[PDB]
């Protein structure tokens, strides 16, 4: 799994913090991974090492072993889980809201929806009359741009995938090898 | 809690704050629960 170790090195820099990534680099070497040996190589405090280990235990990166000496090996399976959560975020970002041009006077700052517009409209004036004040409900325009936001959010999320595409492809090749 | 979670805290503080949030919401619904010590705003006055 030398190729998997190279993929792990790229992911640890990308997702884990720099302090965590250095600890993960010690984990990548499996010849000796005692808790005391890992602490000495890190040069961090035992309490600081324990805090890093607790985050790794939540990540499922490390598995506790009895020897007492504790042996740590790379068992993380949430790299795909984090990538899929990011993919769900991309789908959520594209799926925001519609146009729904809300008639709203910025003077009274009251967003009346396109449904509430018929009540705003007054026949004698002939224009959507701002009910709260006496002006004309103005179009939302730049304010509350849910329709504008979804396209921009989708574009930013789409940009992230090509940078991570090489790592995702390597993970897919590893998954094909696993069967 | 929301701003600290958005920033990305070590989570040691987050574990303490979420329990305090649980205590605050539980205190509002029930004050007769065993544990859940009564909170006094001022002048030794019990909350309702």
């Amino acid at each position: 799994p030398a190729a998997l170790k190279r993929l792990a090195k790229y992911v640890i820099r990308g997702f884990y913090g720099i302090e965590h990534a250095l600890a993960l680099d010690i984990l990548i070497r499996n010849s000796c991974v005692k808790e005391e040996d890992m602490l000495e190589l890190l040069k961090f405090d035992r309490k600081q090492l324990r805090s890093v280990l607790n985050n790794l235990k939540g990540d499922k990166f490390i598995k506790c072993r009895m020897r007492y000496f504790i042996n740590y090996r790379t068992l993380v399976n949430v790299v795909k889980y984090k990538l899929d959560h990011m993919r769900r975020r991309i789908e959520t970002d594209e799926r925001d809201s519609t146009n729904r041009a809300s008639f709203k006077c910025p003077v009274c700052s009251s967003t009346f929806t396109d449904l509430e517009a018929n009540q705003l409209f007054d026949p004698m004036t002939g224009t959507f009359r701002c009910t709260f004040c006496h002006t004309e409900v103005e179009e939302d325009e730049s304010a509350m741009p849910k329709k504008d936001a979804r396209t921009l959010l989708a574009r930013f999320n789409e940009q992230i995938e090509p940078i991570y595409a090489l790592l995702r492809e390597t993970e897919d090749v590893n998954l094909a090898y696993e069967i | 809690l929301r701003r600290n979670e958005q920033n990305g805290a070590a989570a040691h503080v987050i574990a303490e704050d979420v329990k305090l949030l649980q205590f605050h919401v539980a205190t509002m619904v029930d004050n007769e629960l065993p544990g859940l010590p009564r909170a006094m705003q001022k002048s030794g006055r019990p909350l309702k």
């Binding site: 720099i18 302090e19 250095l22 190589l41 040069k43 889980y81 984090k82 899929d84 959560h85 | -």
Partner: protein
Amino acid sequence: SGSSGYKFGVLAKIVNYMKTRHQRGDTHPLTLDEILDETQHLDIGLKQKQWLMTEALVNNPKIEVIDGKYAFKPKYNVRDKKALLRLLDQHDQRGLGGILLEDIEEALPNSQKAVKALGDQILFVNRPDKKKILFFNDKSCQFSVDEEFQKLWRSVTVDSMDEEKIEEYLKR
């Protein structure tokens, strides 16, 4: 007071002086009598000088004597201040646990070192602000991207299991 000679702490001061001249950058082999003349402790008395050589110098745990002249107890290694990049290149030793406390005394001020460190590829990560210093290289491979923590923030399931199975079902 156990065993002491003349003014208290004179032996520890002599070891500190040996370190100080090396940090100054003026390096010369010094005999115990030569150190006494340099520190103006030459008239410490014959008995006190004999006591320092026979017991006080031997007592120090990390003291090293090359041959005729003693060497500074705190740092056996020379303060070269060079080949730090080579130490960084091997991440197995993590730069041999290099500390900024050891640096800044070898031959350069902290202000010059801070400018040099930022310009150089070598970067310093300190878990404690002043207690410990370490040198690491993260490279340019790491990518901030967009909302990288926020995607992790969405995944707050943590210990709970089968969340990935739901994502796999959506992927199908």
